Model the fold of this input.
Amino acid sequence: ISRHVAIPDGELEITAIRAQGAGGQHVNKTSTAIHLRFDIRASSLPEYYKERLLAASHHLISSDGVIVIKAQEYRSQELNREAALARLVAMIKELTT
Amino acid sequence: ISRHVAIPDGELEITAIRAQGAGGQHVNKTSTAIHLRFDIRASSLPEYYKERLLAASHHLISSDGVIVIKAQEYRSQELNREAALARLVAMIKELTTEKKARRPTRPTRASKERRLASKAQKSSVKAMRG
Amino acid sequence: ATVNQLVRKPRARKVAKSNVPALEACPQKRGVCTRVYTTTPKKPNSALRKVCRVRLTNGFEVTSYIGGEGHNLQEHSVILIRGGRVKDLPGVRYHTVRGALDCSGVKDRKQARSKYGVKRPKA
RNA sequence: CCCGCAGAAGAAGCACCGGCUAACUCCGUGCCAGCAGCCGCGGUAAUACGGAGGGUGCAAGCGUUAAUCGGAAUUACUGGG
RNA sequence: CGGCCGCAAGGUUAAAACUCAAAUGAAUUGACGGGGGCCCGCACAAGCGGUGGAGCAUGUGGUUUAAUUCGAUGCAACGCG
RNA sequence: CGCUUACCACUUUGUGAUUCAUGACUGGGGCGAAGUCGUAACAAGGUAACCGUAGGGGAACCUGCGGUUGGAUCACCUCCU
RNA sequence: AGGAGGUAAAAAUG
Done:
């Protein structure tokens, strides 16, 4: 009737960088395995989604629209990416639909 | 993300039947342009959603799933097409919203205050033998 | 004393409430044991205790805590029950006996082995 | 029931051990797993959770559940406010 | 809930299931009051000389940066370690 | 013997009483949780509070009328004998 | 010692 696709864009940062929170001494220096991403704002999702998500006070995002999601509750990186990706699937459409 | 309404041409049977209501002799002779749909469940293709569009009860769709929309407001056949084409999208995509909610709730800051509390009540249970 | 008030209104043999609304004087009752879940206790504690609602064969739709380790029950799994409450989960006043026709015990609980309907290891 | 054979041969586990209410330490997991009739025990040093050692109670029976009475002078005429 | 009464709002009579193992009374103690008493301290009153305005030295925040080490950061941190 | 009068159980039907399950949906209560924001109530709680009655209001509650204490507070200054 | 009379300003919130 109307083919809607939840396709993963290429304009998102898959970088295994530092986690944010607590954890003793490992959280202050190293902090790997936690997918802290950035969904570059001036890119695709043609202006309809970009500024639509910016006119709303939200957590786990930047002030510019480079959404910074933290994926913590998963042990393997295959599932930690799923924690990061699946959150964005629900996150962007939350401020869209 | 990438949204372009499909609604397959050559897959949707459109039936033009007469209208209903008041309005003179105009409403009962050349008001056959009014539209009534015919969207069978056999043109599914998601494999899982169309059956979830059939099981959950709602109108516009019978007990078999041949989805019909008898639009009676317009005077042209053109407006009957697009208005009936929008509701088919407005029913199916609205009903296919099978919310992947989530859970749960397990006390995580209760026992950082609750824990020190009861153990401090140990002095309350010292009113005995020494 | 007010004996004239007593000759009219006698000494009421006050009947107390029951802690087991299953059936009158029943030692046990067979339950259809439905909808398995796990909920949190109250102010005294905090844990993830396995519990189960009980569709009774006398007609009741009650609740019961599953005191045990081995999960040998599901959607139906018709079991038996013994009275008594847990005092820590607000609402439960029964117990899932770990020795029913359906529910067996847990292996390797040597100390006080008659507990949880565990069969005594002859080894 | 009595006489003879008669290798101890064929004949012991259950609950509980913080207090109430007789009986202690150690190890493993960490308000997690679980326990209980009551108060409650468990946040890496648990006499209360699980096991081991030992102890206590009882005995071919022992605990658990349920019901009645006493406990309960918490229906009090006996015998309360 | 039912009965009774009322123009109505309601009144009178009067439960149960369920849920907790506490609720409550008395008096005792610290604290606060733009509450009072009594009393002290440069607290005020009576006077003197300074800060704030200017320049300079130093410390902190903020900012910036490859780093501008870290901690203290109401009285009782800021010429402090 | 046959026939028939009266009485009567059962059944059927009309119309009520009462009682027991179930009923989409909806209201009130408790509990855990304690996510939210409020900080009512308690020192006179920064407006003393409680009871009855009436109105208002997002919530604790507010306000008018009457009653109770299960509420406080009694110094200096000026003057006089 | 008894007794009469006089006397005072508002200010929210953790």
Remarks:
- Chain C has one helix and six strands.
- The CA atoms of residues 3 and 9 of chain C lie 9 Å apart.
- The interface with chain B takes residues 40, 43-44, 46, 48 of chain C (CB under 8 Å).
